[PDB]
């Protein structure tokens, strides 16, 4: 089998494309910009400054998973069992995971919170090896009979850049990063799930990790803080989709409008 | 299963959160700021200059453990047994451990100094390898069946900053540190003990080990010197507790007020 | 035998030369320039800026493979058996493989888009380990009875230059490149097939990879953006051919003129 | 036990403390600054310039170990067999060991010069590996039936400053030092004996090795040259001893007054 | 034996001295300078800019090898059946090996070129590793029964200098070169054959590789361009012979005068 | 026992000192300055510029080993067995070994030149790996039952300083040197033989290798040119001898006066 070696026919590609599902962000304009919601079989980067709502979209996504109405798919190309009792893995790199906030967004979504918490796996990663190693251990979690359908890496680069300071080591960091990006892409594809990552920015404008990361994300956003609680999502890279801006808000309800 | 892999569910996170218990520091103001006292299942950092009292708080924590009335827990949540015959580990990195100082504190506190001394295991560490390894051997100490309910690391970073001078190997250092922070956090959580780390500062305001240490510690204090024997501990990082200041004294009685 | 180590005798080189075939690029001039077209047992490089058509030629190439009329060979020395069910492999470095563009190219040239997508393997590589390893796996695709006659490496250098930003680790880069470059040649030469690499450029005039690449590339082009949709391809290094330019276009038909 | 894991109870520490013995230096003023003599279970450092006595003290000690009256201890806590047939190890790093000088010192202290040579082991180390490896090999030397009670390391740092010259690989050095200081300490403790190290000085007024060494040396002197054959030794680190200066002389007899 | 260890007696040296044969370069003047021709059991180096004829000499030697007359030995030291059916190995570093030139040179030699191509193994190398390995694998070519009497390395340092650039891993390069030079000398010696190497020149008048290469090559020339097709060869380093210049030409014959 | 681990008692050192024998240099002044001749059990270094006579002494030494008038020892301490059919090893670093010069020196001293070549083993080293391996391998030659009594390293540092050129990879050079100096010191001591090394100099006035070498060689000479053929060795380091200058000549006879 060629599929076995990591190769895919032009046709395999066309086939695997049918079984993409999309997860709603609780946001009309944001959903619209993505063409329905966040895709399975892709890595999606949300980049921006502390407070731009990256961690928030992450937590919203874990609640939204526990609501089958928020998962859009072709009923013909994807079985209901594919998306059955779906679960999420949340790799927490800086301690951003808020159980309460899960509860809160759930309550407002009418989803049971207790239920979300029970279907969300949380891996507290204190350094890049742990981070990488956790992403790998997702195969084992699936193979434990856990239908992992959502993967969150929050954040993607925090550890790497706390570890590699001083340009005398970039090339290892860039190489680990590429490994990690590879794994992330691996499990989006071969377990048909959505893979979301949060990232930071810098000057004179870019998301951390240079091209290694950019080339390896399918969909890339910037998140800017608009007035008060409104936010803007700038989609600037997409496999086919056009480049657009979604405004939305983060309130006590969670993500809205 | 998933536990074996390092993953916890949201619901396990709340289930954890009921069995947390608390150790008094013998200062009312410091216990107050702490929300009752030093918490288990968290790493607690005391940063500040030589002579600011960090070693004193580590010692007092060893004395206070051997006093059932100094551990605050939920009777309906934490078995009377899980917290009985409590032992501390004191990984001593610059030779700060004074048994004479233990005596003094226990006497004054009305505790048997002898008892204290007998349930405080001291591990003298001359370098980061020894320091890091002793911490992992805590797992082994509890396998033998010792109720380790307190882990001291005094100090957290002295070895690392003596082993790494000049930007040469700085990336290894930063990861070695992250690896050490994981073990510390791992053993606070898994064994429901309190973990205290002392650290130094540098300018114009920070604790050594950068953010790699920072994100890894759940409570963080800077300890300042007041006049004479008074000191001020400044909680500036905690999950759900307000940034407050706590004044106290260091006397022949140990930590008081 | 000496038919096992890596030494091809002089005579073996001549007997080697007998079995070379050619694949039309769909331009008259470009073909002309090439001694007839893209040689098997050789590596061919298209270097130039983004949008210069490098990728297009790769695609055009995959399409053209499934059309025995576009494959010129020795009737008497290349047994017509050996060129049948010809499959292509396309190692894709930054997500350039457009399956639809394969449809397009196919139609406007009267080929089964379906046959082409069916006989094109696509290895998505997120880093240079994956890229090199995909390349080594072509031995194994063949071992499972796939008549791989076309290899595409698009890009040749995008992963390397992303991993070795910061020229402390340049030597391992260069060596890694070299090692890959061997593979590419070995498998052109031992499995009688054509290997195409695309490359990017720099300044004041050179193709990325320097000389390690240059010395291992047998045919070498610069691709310049002429007016609007026309393009020129400058052949600068070849075994025995004249140095010359070639114009053609890129349209919805594909590579033309 | 915990005892074998590297952990000592606070009671074990008190226990251990009863079995520390002392070793006279042959100078009254020096002994008194040491509060008896060179202590077992501790590392002692003499640091000063070439010619300031350091090596003389090592020699003098090798002699004095074979005068059983020069050993001070608690006959209640240390048995006569623990200090019986006492052998010294002399790790010679630059060629400082003078058998002649050993004879000489002994003839004058009424010790049999021959007995001394016969029970002083000498390891000639040309480099840091050899030096460290010999220190570790003291285990096997004892595990062979040799009551090693005195270990000389003269010099402590000469090999390292000759191997790592000007910053760059400073870290491997600083950790190799740490590993060595670990070993020296361990065998002082586990085999209840005296470890003495010689060291040089630098710019100001500090001993080579920085803090890795300082934090790991229990007692630390600077030895200055007074006039002619007189010297002064400055105690400036000790757990419970007053910092103080001892004057003494070096003569045909060895250390004296 | 001691031969097995790589040790030779002074008498073994003289005995080897006997079995040395020499290969003509078709240059009278070159030949004479060499004291007869290229020596076996030595490494001969041709250093010069591109176009100076190193490759010409290399090729010519491959042909002259195939010419019974052209190999001068001693019949009272060496048997006709050790110089019989000789073969050459030719390591190609930049793809300089032109089998057509082989043919041409050979036709003009009154020797069949086809024969030469059959008695000439060519290893195409794209980097240091492959380069080194092929030269190792020559041992094995003598094992399958091949009478390898001529080893060509063209170029000696092109790969290395394409890999190691700057001051980064210059030491890693110099040691690699050394290992390489060991191998070449070893097989020159132990399989009594002639080893030739080509090299580039740099800035201020030296062959690339420095002393590592120079100390390790018995015979060294600086080949310069004279007027037109005339070339001059400066022997500057040799065992016993004086430093001399020899003029010659490169033509349709190959090397002449 | 302790000789196994590398420990020598003080009395074993005294014993050692008795089996010490000495080899004449053929120079009166030189011999006188050495207190009789080059010593077994010691490493003697000759350092100086090219042409200073280093190699010449090496060669003289290989000759004088074959003339038993030229070996001085205690017949009571050293049985005539130990020094019978002695042999010598010459590790040759830059092709300095001259059988013809061995012959010549030997004729003039009335020794059979053939005899000297037959008991002189010659290792040609092209890099420090070989250099070091060679030296280690002398054990094996002794095991095969060759009475190795003379080890020459001509030269000590040529490889190392050729291989290293870049201040960060200097620390391995130094440790590698130290490792080898250890080997040389080992084998002088273990096999009661003389070990000679030649070294080049730098400026302002030092021999290459620094103190890593200086501390590991017992006897040390700076050899300078006089007028014409006269030469002057300056002994500047020796355990028990005064610094002194010895003048001699180098001629077709060899070393003389």
Author numbering:
A (entry chain D), B (entry chain E), C (entry chain C), D (entry chain F), E (entry chain B), F (entry chain A): 58 to 260, 269 to 322
Text lifted from the article:
Homologous recombination appears to be essential in the repair of double-stranded DNA breaks and the restarting of stalled replication forks. These proteins facilitate a pivotal DNA strand-exchange process between a single-stranded DNA (ssDNA) and a homologous double-stranded DNA (dsDNA) in homologous recombination. Here, we report the first crystal structure of hexameric RadA from Methanococcus voltae devoid of its first 60 amino-acid residues (Δ60MvRadA). The Δ60MvRadA protein is composed solely of the conserved ATPase domain found in RecA orthologues.
Similar to the previously studied Δ62MvRadA, Δ60MvRadA is active in hydrolyzing ATP in the presence of poly(dT)36 but inactive in promoting DNA strand exchange (data not shown). The ATP-binding P-­loop (residues Gly105–Thr112) was ordered with two putative nitrate ions, consistent with the requirement for a high concentration of sodium nitrate in the crystallization solution. The peptide chain was largely ordered except for residues 261–268 in the DNA-interacting L2 region (residues Asn256–Arg285). The central channel is lined by L1 regions (residues Arg218–Arg230) and has a diameter of 10 Å. Each L1 region has three conserved arginine residues (Arg218, Arg224 and Arg230 in MvRadA) in RadA/Rad51/DMC1 proteins. As a result, the central channels of such assemblies are highly positively charged. The conformation of each RadA monomer in the hexameric form clearly resembles the ATPase-active form. A short helix (residues Gly275–Ala282) was observed in the L2 region which corresponds to helix G in EcRecA. The conformational similarity of Δ60MvRadA and the ATPase-active form of MvRadA in the helix G region suggests that this short helix is inherently stable. Unlike the structures of filamentous MvRadA, the hexameric Δ60MvRadA structure revealed a different conformation of Arg74 which is no longer capable of retaining the salt bridge to Glu96.
